[PDB]
């Protein structure tokens, strides 16, 4: 029992295990002694607590690992949800150190956006998983109880699999709706997620030929600021040809200078001019 | 980085601390003027050092050392520093030269591995040469045991105070830097991280061609006179004009005073903006 602040779970065990069993409970706060229960004043996030729990387990393994804990709650519920998720993962890492093949591990997990990321850990580390939410838990509460059993017992476990950084790392950004940004640029689409890494200064330019040759013209229009006609350091003959064409009028050059102020008609005109130039240049279609 | 001053009463421990630091340690001619630990601070080679003045230790075993001198012993045992054992070649301290030797030998176990210096104070009264050869050997053979150095100083005329201070401070710095390098260098040969970062700060990059760059320093600064606030004939300065002409929030700055135009009368002109 990795967290028994009052000791209720230890008391429940002390009255239903088979005779001559072993139950050990650790907690940061002092616990009033319960008969047939071993009580620890040590913490859980310290490898000293690892050694002393080795000491009172002898060479024997462990069959069931219990975790029922929650940090201080009252700060926006975002800090509260994440800290509980990390505590669940650290309890899981402790269980992998002390549990026999086929053991059962049960954890209280607050339901949040990290709930699915922790469930994937027991999936790759155990054989059967399930969330229960017994009736005693308040219906208003977001708490849930996950039981993952059938522990595979590998020879060595990847530290990245137990590292909170690698499990709770946020997934990749989904592909932006370039069609919406081009075909409906007058919509608001409020941005609240952060900016990407590496595209600081929030500015990007390409050459006009790149817009001509690309397979995804919508992607370039919706993600770039300026389509440049500046002759490259070497000197592009296609830029010379595309600049001198009569299809590219003054209106075309105006739109290419400022892509972020364009509308529906302007974007369609750019796509039409791209198709006309591609026909001149002999591109497939 | 600490300098620890110990010795018999009335040898000049408090006078030495007052000389190098600004700690207000009483200096009086009686036996136990300093009844508690005093701390001073000095700067040497752009580093901060502590100087601790101790009450004083008599020639007794540790069992019946009273409360005052146990403050001396506790600092001697549990503080790693350079010990400055102040001796009295004369007998003005009220204790024999013999009793000072035995006291040093008795407390040497407390100096188990520290840097021990024996400084002979109050030598404006009677210096080393005016000693019988048997005593000179007894002082000398103390150095001829372990790593103890003997220095000579006088805290009344301030004759050997600075040289003793610099000598001890330099030796403390060398040993400490040696220890830091040793800790960074592990047994496997892998240089530690903190050592690696301090390597880059020592290193000075230099252009490979060995050519310098032209420096445009005017001739005027070469003949400038350093500004000093105690000089009656100093520069006027803008803050002094500010104080005489009001305060921080009352003085109004004339921003056109330093305008260099063609016709000086054109300053303080309302330049047209819109027509």
């Amino acid at each position: 029992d990795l967290c028994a602040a009052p000791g209720s779970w230890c008391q429940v065990c002390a009255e239903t295990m088979p005779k001559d069993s072993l139950i050990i409970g650790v907690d940061l706060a002092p616990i009033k002694p319960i008969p047939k229960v071993i009580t620890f004043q040590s913490d859980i996030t310290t490898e000293k607590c690892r050694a002393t729990i080795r000491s009172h387990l002898k060479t024997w393994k462990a069959d069931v690992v219990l975790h029922d804990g929650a940090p201080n709650v009252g700060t926006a519920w975002v800090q509260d949800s994440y800290n509980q998720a990390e505590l669940a993962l650290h309890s899981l890492k402790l269980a992998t150190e002390f549990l026999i093949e086929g053991g059962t591990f049960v954890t209280k997990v607050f339901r949040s956006k990290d709930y699915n990321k922790l469930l994937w850990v027991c999936n790759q580390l155990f054989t059967k998983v399930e969330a229960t939410k017994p009736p005693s838990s308040r219906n208003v509460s977001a708490e849930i109880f996950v039981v993952c059993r059938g522990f595979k017992a590998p020879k060595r476990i990847d530290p990245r699999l137990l590292d909170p950084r690698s499990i709770f790392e946020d997934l990749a950004d989904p592909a932006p709706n370039n069609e919406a940004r081009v075909y409906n640029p007058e919509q608001k689409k409020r941005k609240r997620e952060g900016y990407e890494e590496g595209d600081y200064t929030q500015y990007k330019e390409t050459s006009a030929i790149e817009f001509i040759n690309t397979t995804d013209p919508i992607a370039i229009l919706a993600n770039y600021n300026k389509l440049s006609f500046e002759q490259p350091p070497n000197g592009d003959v296609a830029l010379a040809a595309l600049e001198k064409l009569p299809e590219t009028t003054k209106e075309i050059r105006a739109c290419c200078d400022d892509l972020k102020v364009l509308g529906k008609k302007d974007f369609r005109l750019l796509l039409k001019w791209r198709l006309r130039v591609r026909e001149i240049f002999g591109l497939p279609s | 980085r600490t300098l620890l001053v110990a010795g018999f009463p009335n040898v000049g421990k408090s006078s030495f601390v007052r000389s190098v630091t600004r700690a207000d340690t009483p200096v009086e001619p009686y036996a136990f003027t300093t009844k508690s630990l005093f701390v001073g601070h000095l700067d040497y080679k752009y580093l901060r050092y502590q100087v601790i003045d101790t009450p004083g230790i008599l020639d007794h075993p540790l069992e019946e050392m009273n409360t005052i001198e146990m403050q001396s012993v506790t600092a001697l045992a549990h503080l790693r520093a350079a010990v400055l054992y102040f001796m009295d070649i004369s007998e003005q301290c009220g204790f024999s030269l013999k009793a000072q030797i035995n006291l040093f030998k008795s407390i040497k176990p407390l100096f188990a591995n520290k840097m021990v210096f024996i400084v002979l104070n109050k030598m404006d009264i009677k210096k080393f040469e005016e000693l019988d050869p048997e005593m000179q050997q007894e002082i000398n053979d103390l150095t001829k045991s372990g790593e103890v150095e003997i220095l000579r100083a006088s805290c009344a005329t301030q004759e050997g105070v600075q040289e003793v201070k610099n000598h001890v401070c330099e030796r403390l710095l060398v040993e400490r830097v040696s220890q830091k390098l040793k800790a960074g260098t592990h047994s496997n040969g892998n240089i530690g991280t903190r050592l690696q970062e301090v390597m880059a700060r020592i290193h000075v990059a230099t252009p490979m061609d060995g050519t310098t760059r032209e420096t445009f320093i005017p001739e005027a600064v070469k003949n400038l006179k350093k500004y000093d606030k105690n000089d009656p004939n100093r520069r006027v300065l803008a803050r002094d004009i500010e104080e005489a002409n009001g305060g921080a929030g009352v003085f109004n700055v004339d921003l056109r005073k330093d305008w260099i135009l063609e016709n000086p009368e054109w300053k303080y002109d309302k330049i047209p903006e819109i027509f």
Binding site: - | E63, K108, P109, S145, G146
Partner: protein, 166 residues
Amino acid sequence: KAPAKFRPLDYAERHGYIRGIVKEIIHDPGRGAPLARVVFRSPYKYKQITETFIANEGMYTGQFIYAGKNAALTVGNILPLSSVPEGTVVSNVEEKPGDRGALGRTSGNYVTVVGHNPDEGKTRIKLPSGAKKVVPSSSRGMIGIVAGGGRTDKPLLKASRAKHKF
């Protein structure tokens, strides 16, 4: 059970001698050296000290052992390295006076002094691994062979030292 630790530093042991009685010896898992359950007498209070030593080879239960500087130089007593003379086997010796024994606790090792240094008192002690060390004379040590035996199966040969050997 309990770690094998010496008595705390005190005036009585460092200047006199104290009588103590052993009651039994207990084996504990994790090591082969048998612990010795001993009861001492407090010079200041009418209370018995419960401390555990390591049973050397040859001792029994029921000695009036002497703990101090001037104790009898017999097996079962402890003595500062200053008092014990040259060539004597010592076990469970102290690196410094106050660590309650650090060197030579496994089942059968011993340390023999090969020279005493009077002025600036230091005692030279040979380690079981064949190393040479110098320790303060004020340290204590258990006299005799620590129990456990089994010293006929120790292979002492090195690839490099053999090339070093003449």
